[PDB]
Every structure is written in C-alpha cells, then in structure tokens.
C-alpha cells in the first residue's frame with residue numbers, strides 16, 4: 089500500500105501562481121496568447137558577435153524584454169545574469185501571488201540553472217590577468233556559485249525551509265519543480281517558489297553547442313528552423329527564457345484564498361547510463377521517468393490526456409522521445425512541442441514548459457506545434473499543429489531530458 | 504503519526520563502503536589513522552602561481568596523490584578535472600564494495616560539486632578569442648556542465664534510477680548524501696553512490712575567496728593556520744578533497760553480504776535567508792537543519808553523542824555554528840572540526856566530513872581538532888582537542904553550512 093496523491097499518501101499540492109519571461113513576451117499570459125495565435129519568438133540574430141565570428145548559427149530568440157533593462161547600477165554590480173533574471177522573476181511571481189505573508193520557516197526555493205554565473209568567472213579571470221589578485225571583486229564568489237540564483241530568490245522572499253539548485257542541463261528546470269514537490273510532500277515546507285533561469289544567447293554558447301552539431305543551421309528562415317517531430321528537422325534553436333511557479337499544499341492555498349491554476353500530482357527522475365549527451369534510442373528509462381510520475385500521482389497511462397514533449401528538434405532526440413512516450417503507454421495523448429515556437433532555454437526550459445502544461449490544463453487548450461508540415465514516417469504521435477486544440481485535458485505529463493542522460497517527468501492535473 | 508526511521512516509516516539505509524582522496528592520503532583508512540595520530544595535510548604551497556601573483560595566502564593542502572597521475576592522454580583531453588576525480592573515486596568505491604552486481608534500474612548517483620568544469624570555460628573562452636568558434640571542443644558542454652561529474656560516475660557504474668547534482672557551495676557534498684537518502688526512502692532506488700568532488704587549489708580560487716577576507720593568512724606555520732573554534736582563528740585553509748560513499752537499504756545490504764560501516768538515519772535541509780556569504784548570527788535555521796535531521800531519524804537531541812561541525816575557522820562562521828548547536832540542543836556532544844587537519848574542500852567537504860562521521864561511529868573514536876589552544880567564550884562547546892577522544896558514540900550529526908545560507912544536517916547511527 090505505497091503512498092500516492094490519489095490515495096492521500098502525499099498531501100495535495102497545487103500551483104497558485106506562475107511567471108515567465110520569454111522570446112515572445114515578458115508576460116506569461118501574453119506569451120500564452122501569442123503561442124495560441126501561432127506566433128514564434130525565433131528571429132535572425134542582429135547581435136554584432138554573429139557577424140564578428142561568422143558563426144554557423146545566426147538565429148535564436150532573445151527575450152522580448154531584456155532582463156537588464158529593469159536593473160539599476162547597484163544590481164548590475166552585485167549579481168550575475170541568472171541572479172538578475174531570478175530577482176526579476178522572483179518579484180513578479182510574489183506580486184502575481186498577492187504578495188502573501190507566509191511562514192518563512194515553511195517556505196522553500198528550488199531553482200535550477202544550466203551553468204551559473206559563468207560570465208563572472210571570465211570577467212574575474214580577465215581582471216586578474218590585467219591587474220592582479222586584488223582586481224577580483226570580493227563579490228566574485230557569491231555571483232559565480234551556481235546556487236546564486238536560488239540564494240538571491242530565497243533571500244529576496246525570505247525562504248528559510250531550504251534553498252536548492254539541482255543541475256542536470258536541459259532537465260534542471262523540471263528537476264527543480266520535482267524537488268520542490270518532494271520538499272512539500274515529505275513535510276519540510278508547505279509553500280515553494282520553484283523553476284529555472286538561464287543565461288542569454290552569446291558567441292561562446294553558440295560556438296560550444298554548434299560544435300556538438302545539435303543545433304539547426306536553417307538560417308534562411310528563422311521562424312521555421314525549430315521542427316520537432318518533422319522529417320526535415322536539423323537540431324534545436326536557442327530561445328532565451330526564465331520561469332518560476334508558486335506551489336503550496338491545497339490546505340495552505342485555501343487558508344489564504346489563493347485560487348489554484350492546477351495540481352502537481354507526482355514527479356519522476358531516472359537516468360540512461362548510455363551517453364553523456366545523446367539519449368538512449370529505446371526511450372525505456374525516459375518512459376519509466378513518466379511511469380514513475382504516474383505511480384506517485386496514482387494515475388494510470390490511460391488517464392494522460394496530454395504530453396508536453398521535450399521536442400528538442402534533434403533527429404535522434406525526437407526518435408528517442410517517441411519511443412519513451414510509447415514505453416510509458418501515453419502515445420494516445422495529444423502532444424505539444426513548445427520548443428517549436430519558444431526554442432530551447434536549457435536550464436529554464438523544463439520550468440517554462442511546466443508553466444505551459446499548467447495553463448494547458450487551466451484553459452483546456454494546447455497551442456499548435458509550429459513547423460510540423462511533413463510528419464516523420466518513423467514517429468506516430470498525435471502532435472497538435474495548425475490551430476489550438478480545445479480539449480478536456482484532466483491530466484498531463486511534462487517531459488525534460490538533460491545532457492548526461494537525465495530524465496525528469498512531472499505529473500500535472502486540472503483543478 | 505509521522506514516518507521516522509526509528510518507527511519503521513522509512514526503510515533502514517546503511518553505509519556499506521566509503522572512499523576519499525585527501526591531502527593526508529589517497530587511501531581513506533590511511534587518512535583516518537593520520538587524523539587520530541594528529542597529522543595535518545596543510546603544507547606551504549610550492550606552486551609557481553603563489554610567487555607570480557604574490558598571493559596573501561601561501562598555505563594549502565594539495566592531494567597527497569594527484570588525480571591526473573592516474574589519467575591517460577585521452578581522459579585529460581576528454582574530461583574536466585572534477586569528472587576525472589569522479590571517475591577515479593567511482594572505480595575505487597566500486598572495488599572497495601566488492602564490485603557488486605546491482606539492478607541498474609534501482610541504482611542512483613547523487614554527487615554534488617561547488618563550481619563544475621570551470622577551467623574548460625576559460626580555456627574555451629581563450630581558444631575562441633585566439634582562433635574563432637571552430638577552436639572550441641565538441642566536448643566543451645559535457646566537460647563544463649556541473650552535472651558532468653555525476654553523469655560520468657553514473658555512466659561508469661550504470662546508475663539508471665536517477666543521476667542528480669545539488670549545488671549549495673560548501674554544503675554540496677552533504678546535500679548530495681541527503682538527496683540520495685531521499686531517493687531511497689521515497690522508493691526510487693535501493694542503492695546509491697553519493698558524495699562530492701571539487702577542483703584543485705589555484706590562483707583565481709585563492710584571489711576570489713581571499714578578497715572576501717574568508718581565508719587564513721598564517722603562512723609562517725602552515726600546519727597551525729586552520730583553527731576552528733579557537734580564539735586566534737583568522738579564516739579557512741584550502742584542503743583539496745573528493746569523497747564518495749555507497750549507501751543502500753539494510754535489506755539490499757544483507758542480501759549481497761555487504762558489511763555496514765554505519766546507518767544513515769535522517770537528513771535536514773534549511774536556509775538562513777539572511778545574507779549571501781554571512782551565516783545568520785543566531786544559528787536558529789542552521790540548528791533547525793540539525794533538528795529536522797533528528798525528527799526524520801526519530802531521535803531526540805539528548806540521544807546525540809557526537810557532532811562533526813562545519814568548523815571553517817572563520818570568526819563569524821564558528822560563532823554562528825556554536826549558536827546553531829545550542830538551538831539544536833546538541834551542545835552536550837563531543838565536537839570535531841576536521842578542517843583543522845584536512846582544510847576546506849568546498850563541494851567535497853560535506854561528503855568527506857560525512858565519511859569521517861561514519862568512521863567515528865564505526866571505531867568509537869573522535870580525532871583531535873588540531874590547533875585548538877585558546878577556548879573562545881563565544882564558543883561554549885566540548886571541542887575534542889589534544890588526544891583522540893574514545894567512547895560509545897551511538898548517534899552523530901554531520902553539519903555543513905554553504906555560502907548563500909544553505910544548511911545541511913545528516914543524522915548518522917552506529918551499526
């Protein structure tokens with residue numbers, strides 16, 4: 089008689105607020121409406137570094153509204169980028185939540201990132217070489233450490249029931265939400281701010297990722313380069329993003345009159361032990377990740393109406409996920425690959441895509457998967473394309489698969 | 504009622520093997536004998552970079568046995584230092600546990616770290632500035648990503664029940680152990696490889712932490728510089744380290760004839776939300792990390808015989824920890840500050856001090872806190888000093904407190 093959300097073994101956890109900054113818009117609800125209208129965030133990069141280095145990739149989605157356009161001189165001096173993004177999203181999230189007065193002792197922050205304050209390592213390196221060890225800021229360490237974002241958000245909001253930073257590359261954002269859920273169901277907290285943040289698009293990131301040969305080079309037509317599950321896909325597209333959601337026990341959200349957006353029912357974490365950067369082709373462990381989220385939710389595969397696919401738009405990546413969705417027996421669910429419109433935000437993407445899974449369940453709609461024009465004959469899923477599909481989505485699984493063979497799956501339900 | 508290890512709510516988890524590379528020795532058992540003999544791995548740094556920059560800190564503990572002396576030309580070109588450490592310790596641990604055949608679908612890896620593959624960031628940055636984006640390695644991303652060490656260990660040992668990497672600075676190693684324990688009691692695995700790994704001593708690391716005023720500069724007596732809880736303390740000393748342990752359910756241990764070295768009973772994670780690098784002076788949330796560890800273990804503070812303190816030798820750090828142990832009502836316990844001997848491993852250190860906490864319970868002996876000469880009235884603790892302290896220690900807490908206000912306590916028990 090193992091514990092599940094269904095059988096009361098875990099307390100009921102609800103999502104009571106969300107925030108995201110995006111290539112389409114700084115406002116999640118605008119981003120949502122824009123996705124339903126079939127808008128894409130992916131453009132031709134106009135940054136000088138592109139033409140300075142003659143990079144193979146000249147496309148991506150910068151945030152519609154730069155994080156640093158909201159950051160004064162002080163904040164530019166004492167925070168890394170992911171920190172400054174985290175402070176911004178943290179404040180937006182709380183205001184959206186009605187600036188609630190919670191017990192800081194029962195309040196956790198779990199925010200993942202791909203890399204950390206990496207640019208401050210480079211800057212400290214350059215300053216030290218030009219002028220010696222005393223040119224390194226006494227702030228260098230607090231900005232460089234990859235727990236910086238979560239620590240800045242925790243300090244900002246007064247989270248005293250734990251501040252955590254899981255790192256698993258592309259799945260970091262989803263993993264953070266998994267761990268926030270655990271922290272609540274195990275009794276360590278009643279409310280948790282969780283999600284992901286990531287750095288902007290730049291020369292060195294593109295260089296690194298494009299030399300892996302995992303990126304689309306369809307530079308002629310930016311808006312059509314991201315092609316999850318399409319026969320002509322040639323890898324992923326950068327799409328800057330950041331996302332937090334507020335979760336709390338249903339008791340808690342009720343005690344303060346907060347109207348839930350959805351339920352976070354269960355969470356699955358597994359691994360491939362196959363390759364450092366390529367997903368196991370059989371999708372077996374990735375599927376178990378999904379199956380596990382259902383065990384803890386108390387759901388069976390037949391209950392899943394929707395799947396928010398990883399949808400990297402790599403050849404081997406989409407084939408792998410196809411096999412996973414079959415292995416978990418969720419292949420009759422309506423699939424959506426939001427990376428088609430928003431692109432890959434690495435450490436942030438798993439949390440943005442959880443925010444879309446929540447809204448999907450709230451509004452009862454899945455936006456269209458852009459650029460799905462020649463479905464891959466070797467992949468037989470129900471990819472939503474063309475126009476938004478209004479459906480009775482009671483339960484969804486959001487997938488995330490990280491470099492290192494990390495598999496995370498989040499089980500969500502309608503309120 | 505609430506599930507506690509004592510009341511059978513969580514399955515009994517056991518430590519069945521351990522491994523560490525330290526400044527005293529590559530062989531953990533040799534390190535443990537040297538600590539009881541009163542030895543110190545902190546020597547004067549002979550490194551060129553000391554002289555080139557004339558660093559204020561000229562003292563530190565390199566590994567007795569450098570990682571790269573065991574590493575081929577291909578590994579040196581294909582992995583980040585921390586991965587190379589992770590591979591080496593993963594193999595040593597596996598061998599020490601008798602190379603057991605385990606179900607990969609119930610076998611997790613949780614290895615934390617401080618920074619990640621940082622050297623690959625600067626190197627990639629330098630190569631690209633030199634000869635353009637083509638000069639960045641196709642392996643750059645897997646080497647840089649902080650989850651890289653955890654990944655490599657998971658792939659080397661075939662862990663498929665999840666590979667995870669918590670980053671919480673100085674507490675990363677202890678946090679890795681806390682999540683592996685969770686992974687097991689929530690039922691996601693039966694056997695975990697967990698601990699932490701960290702990069703070597705170098706110019707920028709010393710500049711970075713020096714400039715916070717965090718580090719001891721007592722260069723003329725390197726083996727006396729690290730003075731946890733002592734009146735004349737003046738900051739921490741770098742001591743290179745990596746540490747891993749094998750934990751598993753008692754049931755799983757029994758069934759393969761593995762001899763338990765100790766029990767892992769409970770794990771608390773709290774946060775100060777006080778300051779980015781200063782611990783809260785009151786020690787309340789720190790102590791509540793200890794308290795939480797005992798709730799889950801089913802112990803009362805009165806049952807705690809030993810505490811394996813953070814003991815960084817920072818003036819404000821030790822003060823706060825002393826109050827933390829007072830709030831946890833564990834201030835009756837025989838206290839040890841291993842950093843006195845082995846220095847500060849940052850990411851690794853919690854993993855290391857967790858292993859030393861195991862061997863303390865196994866052998867009924869606490870080593871002496873080196874350089875404890877002038878009791879601080881602000882620290883009213885029973886700090887073990889002078890001669891080892893022998894006794895029937897049944898229950899021990901291992902404290903870690905990271906920059907960013909992350910507090911990890913681990914409840915351990917004699918087998």
Ligand SMILES: O=S(=O)(CCCC(F)(F)F)Nc1ccc2cnccc2c1
Pocket residue numbers: 169170202203204205206207286287288289290293326327328329432433434
């Ligand atoms: O994976 S990353 O390299 C880029 C991700 C890009 C995008 F997908 F669009 F989000 N992460 C970071 C992290 C910190 C950085 C700080 N300064 C400059 C770039 C950074 C990129």
Ligand SMILES: O=S(=O)(CCCC(F)(F)F)Nc1ccc2cnccc2c1
Pocket residue numbers: 584585617618619620621622701702703704705708741742743744847848849
């Ligand atoms: O905290 S760190 O800066 C120094 C480690 C401290 C200690 F281990 F205790 F000595 N971490 C790293 C990480 C990666 C590195 C790769 N190459 C050079 C140095 C590195 C330091």
Ligand code: NA
Pocket residue numbers: 396397398399441486487488
């Ligand atoms: Na997804």
Ligand code: NA
Pocket residue numbers: 811812813814856857901902903
């Ligand atoms: Na300790």
